[PDB]
Design an enzyme around this catalytic site. Structure first.
Site, PDB file in Angstrom:
ATOM      1  N   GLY D  47       0.834  -1.182   0.000  1.00  0.00           N
ATOM      2  CA  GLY D  47       0.000   0.000   0.000  1.00  0.00           C
ATOM      3  C   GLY D  47       0.871   1.236   0.000  1.00  0.00           C
ATOM      4  O   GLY D  47       2.100   1.161   0.003  1.00  0.00           O
ATOM      5  N   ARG D  48       0.204   2.385   0.003  1.00  0.00           N
ATOM      6  CA  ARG D  48       0.926   3.644  -0.043  1.00  0.00           C
ATOM      7  C   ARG D  48       0.138   4.739   0.652  1.00  0.00           C
ATOM      8  O   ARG D  48      -1.082   4.841   0.493  1.00  0.00           O
ATOM      9  CB  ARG D  48       1.216   4.067  -1.490  1.00  0.00           C
ATOM     10  CG  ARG D  48      -0.024   4.131  -2.358  1.00  0.00           C
ATOM     11  CD  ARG D  48      -0.233   5.519  -2.947  1.00  0.00           C
ATOM     12  NE  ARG D  48      -1.007   6.391  -2.067  1.00  0.00           N
ATOM     13  CZ  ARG D  48      -1.236   7.678  -2.311  1.00  0.00           C
ATOM     14  NH1 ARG D  48      -0.759   8.234  -3.417  1.00  0.00           N
ATOM     15  NH2 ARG D  48      -1.950   8.405  -1.461  1.00  0.00           N
ATOM     16  N   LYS D  50       1.007   9.102   0.814  1.00  0.00           N
ATOM     17  CA  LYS D  50       1.765  10.033  -0.006  1.00  0.00           C
ATOM     18  C   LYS D  50       2.954  10.620   0.740  1.00  0.00           C
ATOM     19  O   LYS D  50       3.618  11.525   0.224  1.00  0.00           O
ATOM     20  CB  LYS D  50       0.859  11.133  -0.548  1.00  0.00           C
ATOM     21  CG  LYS D  50       0.390  10.791  -1.948  1.00  0.00           C
ATOM     22  CD  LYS D  50       0.255  11.994  -2.848  1.00  0.00           C
ATOM     23  CE  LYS D  50      -0.822  12.944  -2.377  1.00  0.00           C
ATOM     24  NZ  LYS D  50      -0.692  14.254  -3.071  1.00  0.00           N
ATOM     25  N   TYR D  51       3.228  10.125   1.944  1.00  0.00           N
ATOM     26  CA  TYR D  51       4.512  10.307   2.597  1.00  0.00           C
ATOM     27  C   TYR D  51       5.400   9.075   2.472  1.00  0.00           C
ATOM     28  O   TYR D  51       6.591   9.150   2.790  1.00  0.00           O
ATOM     29  CB  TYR D  51       4.299  10.654   4.077  1.00  0.00           C
ATOM     30  CG  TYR D  51       5.577  10.867   4.847  1.00  0.00           C
ATOM     31  CD1 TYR D  51       6.492  11.833   4.457  1.00  0.00           C
ATOM     32  CD2 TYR D  51       5.878  10.087   5.955  1.00  0.00           C
ATOM     33  CE1 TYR D  51       7.666  12.028   5.156  1.00  0.00           C
ATOM     34  CE2 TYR D  51       7.050  10.272   6.662  1.00  0.00           C
ATOM     35  CZ  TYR D  51       7.942  11.244   6.258  1.00  0.00           C
ATOM     36  OH  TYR D  51       9.111  11.431   6.959  1.00  0.00           O
ATOM     37  N   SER D  52       4.861   7.960   1.983  1.00  0.00           N
ATOM     38  CA  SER D  52       5.564   6.687   2.029  1.00  0.00           C
ATOM     39  C   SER D  52       5.032   5.776   0.932  1.00  0.00           C
ATOM     40  O   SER D  52       4.056   6.093   0.249  1.00  0.00           O
ATOM     41  CB  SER D  52       5.398   6.023   3.399  1.00  0.00           C
ATOM     42  OG  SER D  52       4.090   6.247   3.904  1.00  0.00           O
ATOM     43  N   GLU D  53       5.699   4.633   0.775  1.00  0.00           N
ATOM     44  CA  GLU D  53       5.228   3.545  -0.080  1.00  0.00           C
ATOM     45  C   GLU D  53       5.801   2.256   0.493  1.00  0.00           C
ATOM     46  O   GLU D  53       7.012   2.028   0.407  1.00  0.00           O
ATOM     47  CB  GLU D  53       5.654   3.740  -1.536  1.00  0.00           C
ATOM     48  CG  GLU D  53       4.737   4.649  -2.350  1.00  0.00           C
ATOM     49  CD  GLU D  53       4.661   4.261  -3.815  1.00  0.00           C
ATOM     50  OE1 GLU D  53       5.704   3.886  -4.391  1.00  0.00           O
ATOM     51  OE2 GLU D  53       3.555   4.337  -4.393  1.00  0.00           O
ATOM     52  N   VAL D  54       4.945   1.425   1.083  1.00  0.00           N
ATOM     53  CA  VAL D  54       5.386   0.203   1.747  1.00  0.00           C
ATOM     54  C   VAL D  54       5.281  -0.964   0.776  1.00  0.00           C
ATOM     55  O   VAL D  54       4.397  -1.011  -0.088  1.00  0.00           O
ATOM     56  CB  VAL D  54       4.578  -0.066   3.036  1.00  0.00           C
ATOM     57  CG1 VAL D  54       4.755   1.080   4.021  1.00  0.00           C
ATOM     58  CG2 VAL D  54       3.107  -0.281   2.719  1.00  0.00           C
ATOM     59  N   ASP D 153      -0.764   8.682  16.399  1.00  0.00           N
ATOM     60  CA  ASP D 153      -1.482   8.103  15.269  1.00  0.00           C
ATOM     61  C   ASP D 153      -1.997   6.709  15.608  1.00  0.00           C
ATOM     62  O   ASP D 153      -1.844   5.773  14.816  1.00  0.00           O
ATOM     63  CB  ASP D 153      -0.590   8.046  14.026  1.00  0.00           C
ATOM     64  CG  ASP D 153      -1.390   7.940  12.738  1.00  0.00           C
ATOM     65  OD1 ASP D 153      -2.630   8.084  12.793  1.00  0.00           O
ATOM     66  OD2 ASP D 153      -0.780   7.709  11.672  1.00  0.00           O
TER      67      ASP D 153
HETATM   68  N1  LIG Z   1       5.167  -5.106   9.544  1.00  0.00           N
HETATM   69  C1  LIG Z   1       4.133  -5.281   8.687  1.00  0.00           C
HETATM   70  N2  LIG Z   1       3.665  -6.516   8.401  1.00  0.00           N
HETATM   71  C2  LIG Z   1       2.638  -6.704   7.551  1.00  0.00           C
HETATM   72  N3  LIG Z   1       1.998  -5.704   6.921  1.00  0.00           N
HETATM   73  C3  LIG Z   1       2.362  -4.414   7.114  1.00  0.00           C
HETATM   74  C4  LIG Z   1       3.476  -4.125   8.030  1.00  0.00           C
HETATM   75  N4  LIG Z   1       3.629  -2.788   8.040  1.00  0.00           N
HETATM   76  C5  LIG Z   1       2.694  -2.265   7.205  1.00  0.00           C
HETATM   77  N5  LIG Z   1       1.939  -3.233   6.653  1.00  0.00           N
HETATM   78  C6  LIG Z   1       0.839  -3.030   5.706  1.00  0.00           C
HETATM   79  O1  LIG Z   1       1.071  -1.820   5.012  1.00  0.00           O
HETATM   80  C7  LIG Z   1      -0.196  -1.163   4.733  1.00  0.00           C
HETATM   81  C8  LIG Z   1      -0.161   0.239   5.292  1.00  0.00           C
HETATM   82  O2  LIG Z   1       0.725   1.080   4.560  1.00  0.00           O
HETATM   83  P1  LIG Z   1       0.619   2.666   4.665  1.00  0.00           P
HETATM   84  O3  LIG Z   1      -0.829   2.957   4.349  1.00  0.00           O
HETATM   85  O4  LIG Z   1       1.597   3.167   3.630  1.00  0.00           O
HETATM   86  O5  LIG Z   1       1.020   2.961   6.091  1.00  0.00           O
HETATM   87  C9  LIG Z   1      -1.284  -2.064   5.318  1.00  0.00           C
HETATM   88  O6  LIG Z   1      -1.771  -2.941   4.302  1.00  0.00           O
HETATM   89  C10 LIG Z   1      -0.526  -2.872   6.368  1.00  0.00           C
HETATM   90  O7  LIG Z   1      -1.105  -4.121   6.677  1.00  0.00           O
END
Ligand SMILES: Nc1ncnc2c1ncn2[C@@H]1O[C@H](COP(=O)(O)O)[C@@H](O)[C@H]1O
Ligand SMILES: Nc1ncnc2c1ncn2[C@@H]1O[C@H](COP(=O)(O)O)[C@@H](O)[C@H]1O
Ligand SMILES: Nc1ncnc2c1ncn2[C@@H]1O[C@H](COP(=O)(O)O)[C@@H](O)[C@H]1O
Ligand SMILES: Nc1ncnc2c1ncn2[C@@H]1O[C@H](COP(=O)(O)O)[C@@H](O)[C@H]1O
Ligand SMILES: [Cl-]
Ligand SMILES: [Cl-]
Ligand SMILES: [Cl-]
Ligand SMILES: [Cl-]
Ligand SMILES: [Cl-]
Ligand SMILES: [Cl-]
Ligand SMILES: [Cl-]
Ligand SMILES: [Cl-]
Ligand SMILES: [Cl-]
Ligand SMILES: [Cl-]
Ligand SMILES: [Cl-]
Ligand SMILES: [Cl-]
Ligand SMILES: [Cl-]
Ligand SMILES: [Cl-]
Ligand SMILES: [Cl-]
Ligand SMILES: [Cl-]
Lengths: 326, 325, 325, 326
Positions: D47-48, D50-54, D153
């Site tokens: 997911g993302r 707009k401060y990050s992209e995980v 948060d």
């Molecule tokens: N340590 C983690 N393990 C599994 N999923 C994560 C983890 N950290 C973030 N996520 C997933 O990342 C997304 C959130 O990303 P964001 O909206 O950019 O903060 C959600 O789908 C979360 O479940």
């Protein structure tokens, strides 16, 4: 003379289905007793074929993670065939576990494997990581073959690996079929990179030896670091890439032995001499390539499906000696 | 002091030079003790000349822990073991001392589910030996890079959870910080894994003592013969070592360090050095590889300076089928 | 036979009527034995009047297993335990007998990492008691629905891996298939968990015997008093039961089944029934809930027919904060 | 008189940062020493913002699963602030573990939690599943508060739960900030459904009590089965939904105590009387609602941030007695 009278019978596990009840192999008359479907909620779509659509799910009552596979309600014999095979291979080594079957579109509930994709996990494998996980894949292939079931779709995609637990599971049994000796099967099975020569020449009297060629295509790709090993643009070109390596002398002989009518669309196949497996060895894969491997891969990738190594014979090969538990 | 020929570790000798006095001064340490009632004893694990080990329960976490209670006869040594376990908390394959409690002191260690070595090692494949000994080298290289010798490497002190493919080096009571130029007590480790430096009373040893103990473990696992150097005593332990390594290299070892030998081996003979491949029988021929014979020859040596360090052993071609690097 | 007042289980009485003779006929069973050398003994676990239990190793899987070797003096009973463990392989919270091996016979069970009960139970919260006893009811209801009484429910036979929140009912040597109208030996279970039917020699009992044993476990865990019915003998065990449940309901229990009592309790007194809330002290008041007192009153009863079945106990409001259904 | 002289100081953990070295709280002068980034390969985008992209990642050397978070290279003080807080809370109960930091765009490597989404896992919770996981969330909040860090948060999205292992981890520390007594902080923190009254009236002298209101909004939503509990369309309407429940008498008093200038955009807020928490109880949530809960939630959702229960005081409440280990 329309059918072929020169015929092949599996060297191993030829008459295992004759020693099981009729309910075992007669999947058309199976009676699926469905369980409530709202015990599983869809979380995320893992992917889709056009025969299926797999999702990540939740056992709302058990609160574990499962994978739901919603099948198209267009076919029933294939639907009950897959449920028939998974129910029979329920307690098999490294076989994906089917936990439940729901409806209201039939939905099949599988166990979830914390796996990593293959285009990323395999390039990190070492020499003994290849020998280990392939031996575990052979354990699953040998079991279903001993149960009269051939997978007919062995490929790295259909092999889940939980490297954190040293766990392997063979998934995607939608193309698997029961083996009765003397049966003519559909050759439009498996995928292009792993189709055996019997599928490319339309030889329908194949057995469990089909899964063995696809296993050799997997082992040759990971050890030689070439994915895929036989990279063909078409089903016609896929055979050309095989004849390119195994030679034309043994190919024409494979056809004359089983009196296979090769469609003259393959006439443009020229004279090819058999190559040495050592020619595919370079500086990158030289640590994975061993004398034991070059012998095993030579006895796996054969034209003659009968002369190929069985799943049990491949497990006893010296290539798995550094990992086999005695 | 004691006049002798000097020797300094060629690696990790100046690690303690890069750390404050707070790191190695284990007597200045002040331990913040915690209540002992949070942990109860379930089953007694092992006896000891200086301690007792039990199976524990972490009453709040209710997980399994291991309690090692000590006789209080030694303050400075008790603080020495707590000092070393507190410096290697981030160490790979190092046991995690969870807490200290209070009579007598007790040390809480994490619990590892494992099978005894001589019931698990006979089931090891070529894969298992190279993988697990590489994990053990990770723990040895880290502690040496932190300036700590273990001085008791043996299969009893190697905890293996095979179901999870985990390995943890335990029992740091005989460990010690390494400062260049320091005689340590030669009364360390156990007989079958004592280095030649301990047997000739060469006290200026270093981290390479653990490497000889590592080579003794590896040579026995590969050749299927526990122990590899079967000795009745610490005197016979040396005779069994030179019976294999040869009298010629033994003479060069005593000359380089001017080791005046004890009167007891008066009747020692001249043993021609036996090659490492002569120990390959039909039972272990699949475990004896050509790269192993090169590794075992560069580990089991009289002179501790020419032995392979931990990091040098991890980069050896013997671990190629298992090492990701 | 033996002339007595009859009794039939009001639930799960005709389960064996729906199964072939192959299911319950445990003497016709033919066992396919396997080599014993695949499993080696690591540590002896428990002694026994009829067996010995050890810690095992699955030499090919190298996982932990539990081997229960038996004296061969009894064929029919040995086959009875193997027959029952083979019928409950899909049972929730039932121990998984992995294999049988061969002198003497040995039975391979799966290994459960757990802490002894009286070291783990004192740390149980209200959540832990309701959750784990509900898991134990899952195993009892399945075996009863398969026509099998356990006849030895006690904390010793309940294996709990708390780190994984697992529970496994073990030791099915005293188990037995239930056919309506069959005297079973009253010499079953252990003293603190024997039902009143065993103490008055009422042999036509059924699955409800395990429910009295379950109520004895629950009442002691909640009221913090192990055992809840502390008896010196099987005669004093009954006296301690009527000391709580009262002489009035005891008289109605002996009249309904025409139980001619033994000469020994000659000097038994008239005990006025003590309410269940009288056992709530300041130490267990947080575990004694109003719904528990209703559950414990409908479990611990003289008449086995009016006791709650396993499934009826799982649907009780006492398990509402923990049950997903 | 421009700044406010009627000022608030945290009742707990007020001067913890004064007892730590300067390198602890001075994140602007932190020196991140980066590790090679090709040790981690991206598998799938989780997911993302707009401060990050995980992303879902692979420790190519360790072959475990990790979550990589590629931050925008537009800000550095916020970048080093998050790395500063995660490094300080490395050994905290139920705190998400930061394993590595890479560059070449800074990338932060976290441990992977086999979690399930919250819109699906929470509706399956029982009474003691709520008391357990919320107590574990309080363990994480109390630790960072004791370390001088407020999350700012707290929401079900930022709370990972591995129900298979009974594991909980508090994630997403990009909005977390160190607490110095007397500091005026940005009120544009947290999310609308969980913003405290101090954020909606622009009272910048808040402390760890901020995370406590968001915790109360979470606990009230799961027990009363209403997500969210304070459902407001805007930041202005969000305060109206709060005054609607807590009443206007205590609100005007909360402003007069701290001399908060309420912008007359809130003049349209009418007279609201305080409601009983029992009015939100229905047939669906009646088993989750208890006398102990109604007391705890009444002492958590308060206007006055100082009179709210701390994370430690909430843990000692009788609502967690059936789950607290003594
Ligand atoms: N340590 C983690 N393990 C599994 N999923 C994560 C983890 N950290 C973030 N996520 C997933 O990342 C997304 C959130 O990303 P964001 O909206 O950019 O903060 C959600 O789908 C979360 O479940
Ligand atoms: N048991 C399972 N555990 C995890 N992922 C699975 C499982 N079964 C299938 N998949 C995923 O489903 C996708 C394949 O779906 P399909 O292409 O429809 O066969 C791939 O992303 C697989 O990793
Ligand atoms: N951390 C641990 N986890 C599991 N077993 C241990 C641990 N430490 C010691 N042991 C056992 O204790 C014995 C080793 O001797 P000692 O270190 O003296 O207790 C062996 O039986 C080990 O299995
Ligand atoms: N499957 C098992 N896993 C772990 N421990 C067991 C198992 N079965 C029995 N035990 C142990 O054996 C004892 C129980 O008595 P017995 O059933 O006679 O062996 C207790 O000490 C248990 O911890
Ligand atoms: Cl056969
Ligand atoms: Cl049939
Ligand atoms: Cl659960
Ligand atoms: Cl060639
Ligand atoms: Cl210093
Ligand atoms: Cl010493
Ligand atoms: Cl020589
Ligand atoms: Cl080699
Ligand atoms: Cl029948
Ligand atoms: Cl009996
Ligand atoms: Cl009365
Ligand atoms: Cl209650
Ligand atoms: Cl404070
Ligand atoms: Cl500083
Ligand atoms: Cl690894
Ligand atoms: Cl109201």
């Amino acid at each position: 003379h329309r059918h072929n009278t020169v015929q092949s019978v599996s060297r191993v596990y030829a008459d295992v289905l004759s020693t099981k009840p009729q309910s075992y192999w007669d999947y058309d008359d199976l009676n699926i007793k469905w369980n409530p479907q709202e015990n599983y909620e869809i979380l995320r779509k893992l992917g889709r074929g056009k025969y299926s659509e797999v999702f990540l799910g939740i056992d709302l009552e058990k609160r574990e993670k499962v994978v739901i596979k919603v099948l198209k309600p267009v076919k029933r014999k294939k639907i009950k065939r897959e449920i028939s095979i998974l129910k029979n291979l329920v307690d098999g080594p490294n076989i994906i576990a089917m936990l439940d079957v729901v409806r209201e579109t039939p939905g099949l509930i599988f166990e979830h494997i914390n796996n990593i994709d293959f285009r990323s996990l395999y390039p990190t494998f070492t020499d003994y990581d290849i020998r280990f996980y392939m031996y575990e894949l052979l354990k699953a292939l040998d079991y279903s073959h001993s149960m009269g079931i051939m997978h007919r779709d062995v490929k790295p995609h259909n092999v889940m690996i939980d490297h954190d637990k040293k766990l392997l599971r063979l998934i995607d049994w939608g193309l698997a079929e029961y083996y009765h000796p003397g049966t003519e099967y559909n050759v439009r099975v498996a995928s292009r990179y792993f189709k055996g020569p019997e599928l490319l020449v339309d030889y329908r009297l194949y057995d469990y030896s089909l899964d063995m060629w696809s296993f050799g295509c997997m082992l040759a790709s990971m050890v030689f670091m070439k994915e895929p090993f036989f990279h063909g643009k078409s089903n016609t070109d896929q055979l050309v890439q095989i004849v390119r390596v195994l030679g034309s002398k043994n190919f024409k002989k494979y056809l004359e032995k089983y009196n296979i009518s090769l469609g003259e669309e393959y006439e443009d196949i020229g004279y090819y001499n058999k190559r040495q497996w050592v020619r595919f060895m370079n500086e990158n894969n030289k640590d994975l390539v061993s004398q034991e491997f070059l012998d095993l891969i030579d006895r796996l990738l054969r034209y003659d499906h009968q002369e190929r190594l069985t799943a049990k014979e491949a497990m006893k090969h010296a290539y798995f000696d550094p990992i086999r538990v005695a």
